[PDB]
Amino acid sequence: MHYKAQLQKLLTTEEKKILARLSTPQKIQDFLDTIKNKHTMWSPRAVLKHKHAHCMEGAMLAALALAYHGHSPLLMDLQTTDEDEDHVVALFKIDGHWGAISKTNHPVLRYRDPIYKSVRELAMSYFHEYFIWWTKKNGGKKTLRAYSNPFDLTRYKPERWVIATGDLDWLAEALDDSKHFPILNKKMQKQLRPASRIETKAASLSEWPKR
Amino acid sequence: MHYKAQLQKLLTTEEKKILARLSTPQKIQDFLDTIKNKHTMWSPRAVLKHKHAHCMEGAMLAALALAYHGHSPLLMDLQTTDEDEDHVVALFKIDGHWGAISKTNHPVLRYRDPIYKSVRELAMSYFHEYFIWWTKKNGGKKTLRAYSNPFDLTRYKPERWVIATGDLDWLAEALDDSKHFPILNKKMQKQLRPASRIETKAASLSEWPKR
């Protein structure tokens, strides 16, 4: 309630009217679906203004909306080899089970229903669909290597990220530097099989055109 | 070794030459990739003859090839609502971790690398990608509800399935009747969100044409 009070001090009437509607994790994901998928690392304020977001911008807005209704604003980092880019989601729980809100342009690394018994279990549900699909060089290689502990944005003064103008590279870097848990050892990595051609083709589909 | 001996008594020279090559789970999956995806429920013999298979025909051949190299021939049933069809995979383990060999025509319910710490964890990696994609009626509804214990085909005389002529509906029925574990309760089911339009479109892609 205290955290929510701090948020209300920072937000305009329009912002609060939006956040008030987004009262369930499902409603939040529905809202992110209407934002155009994509320089900089916008605040939730900027995202609501310009209605454009990459993954971490999407997750930060989700975390804000979750916090506005009394959930912890939690991020999880999905960390890849240098061949790929990391992905960030907003974690949530309902009746003891983990779910995830996700902003992505492709049919992989999507929303997760609150049915996963642990962070690990949820994270593992992404592994098989995190692969190189955009080039033939290591075509189909599975690139996920680690997941973060839930990253609680409560540790910061909300001004620092909710309404920031300053570009939040520091926040991205803090997330990347937090505790991560490896998914493989060296033996397991050697076992990995590439995704099939049908899988890479499917992953390549786009929600929003690359205009 | 005893089980393998029984298999060798039943198999032709050609059959054994094939099974001898398929010495890793990865090699087996590669082989199933060359079989055309699809009445009846053919034996591994029939599948090797006609080079055509649905999911359970694929999994039984996989289980045979696994057994020929000393693994348990294990099946896992993935059980859906009445709106969908069940799917069967062949489970395997390498260094204490579960993987799965799978025969499917679509970019979902595919192979799983041996990295999953439990049957449950592996089964849960399929949940989000098991949905209605072929009609608008309950379009995108997530239909997986339970997974079986590993089903060891060792319980039967190998003649009964490896080289059967008789159509193996009884084997399918025995699998469906084995111990299953629910994934949801009624509360969780009410939380479920439909897959997106981009997801149903991606799932609809076909490896083999529907000629």
Numbering used by the authors:
A (entry chain A), B (entry chain A): 1 to 38, 45 to 217
Question: What do the authors report?
Answer:
The CPR-C4 protein, including an N-terminal His6-tag, crystallized in two space groups with different crystal morphologies but similar resolution limits. However, the absence of other metal cations in the zinc-free crystal structures implies this is not a promiscuous site, and the tetrahedral ligand arrangement is strongly preferable for Zn2+ binding over other transition metal cations or the sodium and potassium present in the buffers used.
Here, we present the structural and functional elucidation of CPR-C4, a hypothetical protein from the genome of a thermophilic Candidate Phyla Radiation organism, identified through metagenomic sequencing. Furthermore, detailed structural and sequence alignment analysis enabled identification of a noncanonical cysteine-histidine-leucine(carbonyl) catalytic triad.
